[PDB]
Amino acid sequence: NLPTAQEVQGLMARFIELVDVGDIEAIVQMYADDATIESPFGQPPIHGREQIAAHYRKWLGGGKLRVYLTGPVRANHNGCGTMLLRKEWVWNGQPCATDVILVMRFDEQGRIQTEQRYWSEVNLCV
Ligand SMILES: */C(C)=C\C(=O)c1ccc2cc(OC)ccc2c1
């Protein structure tokens, strides 16, 4: 009854494609109304399309954030998918780069219900 692996792959691919061009309005639509993006920093989770919109607006509004799909998009048949990305930007006045594993869980309507992210900071200074 949930989205097949192929659908998940396509959806996450499209998600990356939407992030690449900074289509925030389109991105927010891919999430469920009560979607949740858990924090990888031990903060309380983002919840609702409003907070998600604000989050993506904040982080993508600048345009100075690069995101590259490094690994292939994998997915099971439990409506869950995973992918490996590299994020590159600069906070304050210090260059920053990190590898990120995104895990997305889709609902029966094909929208993102729960999303998790796992970081691995890239060595740059030494
Ligand atoms: C990349 C430069 C940043 C993130 O991917 C990022 C930043 C902040 C949050 C907060 C949160 O819950 C408050 C969930 C995910 C992220 C992701």
From Swiss-Prot:
GO molecular function: steroid Delta-isomerase activity
Pfam family, one: SnoaL_2
Transit peptide as UniProt keyword: no
Active site: 15 (proton donor), 39 (proton acceptor)
GO biological process: steroid metabolic process
Key words of the record: Isomerase, Lipid metabolism, Steroid metabolism
Protein name as annotated: Steroid Delta-isomerase
